[PDB]
Each structure stands twice: as C-alpha cells, then as structure tokens.
Amino acid sequence: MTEYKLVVVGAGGVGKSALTIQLIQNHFVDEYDPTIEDSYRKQVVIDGETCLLDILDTAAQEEYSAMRDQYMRTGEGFLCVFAINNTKSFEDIHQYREQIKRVKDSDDVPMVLVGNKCDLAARTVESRQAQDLARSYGIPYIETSAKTRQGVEDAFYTLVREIRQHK
C-alpha cells in the first residue's frame, strides 16, 4: 500500500512532538516522553485508500541534526508548525520554508501551515494573519491543539491530500 513520508518542522516548543504523538499514539504507554528527534508509523485510511504514514518529528533549526538535509530530501510533505501564542515561531516559518526550498530545489513542495495551541486564550498570532501567509504560499492553514486533539487528524490528513494532489 501507499507510503507517505511526512516531516514535522518548526521552532522550539511549538508542539511538533505533541502533535505527532497525538496522531500516532496507541496509549499503551500512558505518557510518552519525546525529547529526541524520531520517526513514527501510522496506518490510516484516507478517502478509501489505506496509507502507511512515516512521520519524522524534527528538532528546531537551532538544534544540530546530522541528517537534516537528508530527511528533507526524503520528506514528501511538511507540516510547518508555529504556536498561536509565540510570534517568533510564526515569524520563523519563513526560515523553515526556505530550508525546505533550499534542499528540495522547488517552490511547490507539499506543505500545511499549522497554528498549534489553539486551546490557549493568550493568542498573539491572529488566524487571519496566518491565513494570509498560507495563501501567499498556496498552502492550507489548519489550527490545532495537541492537548484537546482538535484539528490534529485534519492537519496530517490534509497534508496527505496535498501530496496526492501534487501527485
């Protein structure tokens, strides 16, 4: 069946790991501690088709990762995550996108912009601002909470559909 290589990127603390674990966790382990970069597998049916998702949870740009360029080459679609209470993380999206362009040599790489931590009242990035940004790149914008689980499935499955539509 169809395998998708997905990569989760973004600034430190935005919830890259929390999102990934929320999607892929089977709850055998009650609380799972993800301190390192790692890969995780999830089998899912999307629009009638059984997909195997291979999901790479990455470190922020400021962290050293030897395989960084290679996993961006491998990656077929990217969740570009910022937190709605962290303006710097939203501003850093430009840099994550540029890194993906640098490696893959394309302006048309499948991506979804994800405003995480939407359960929090203390918002500093308005949804309209992020919609405008996503529209300028021709990518979807999805808000999520890794805590309440709102939007998590939508974010990842939307990314899969972007990859499929890119073909």
With CB under 5 to 8 Å by kind, the binding choice for 164 among Mg ion, ligand GNP, none is none
CA dist 92 and 82 (Å) reads 8
- Positions in the binding site for Mg ion (CB under 5 A): 16-17
What is the residue type of 30? Answer: D
Residue from 6, 79, 134, 146 that binds ligand GNP (CB under 6 A)? 146
Helix (H, G, I), strand (E, B) or coil at 125: coil
Least distance in angstroms from the C-beta of 36 to Mg ion: 8
For residue 158, give the nearest of 56, 53, 58 by alpha carbon: 53
Least distance in angstroms from the C-beta of 49 to ligand GNP: 28
Residue number, 76 or 92, with CB nearest to ligand GNP: 92
Give how far the C-alpha of residue 167 lies from the chain's centroid of Cα atoms, to the nearest Å: 19
With CB under 5 to 8 Å by kind, the binding choice for 163 among ligand GNP, Mg ion, none is none
For residue 6, give the nearest of 15, 142, 16 by alpha carbon: 16
With CB under 5 to 8 Å by kind, the binding choice for 103 among Mg ion, ligand GNP, none is none
For residue 143, give the nearest of 165, 122, 120, 160 by alpha carbon: 120
Q: Where along the sequence are the contacts to ligand GNP (CB under 6 A)?
A: 12-18, 59-60, 116-117, 119-120, 145-147
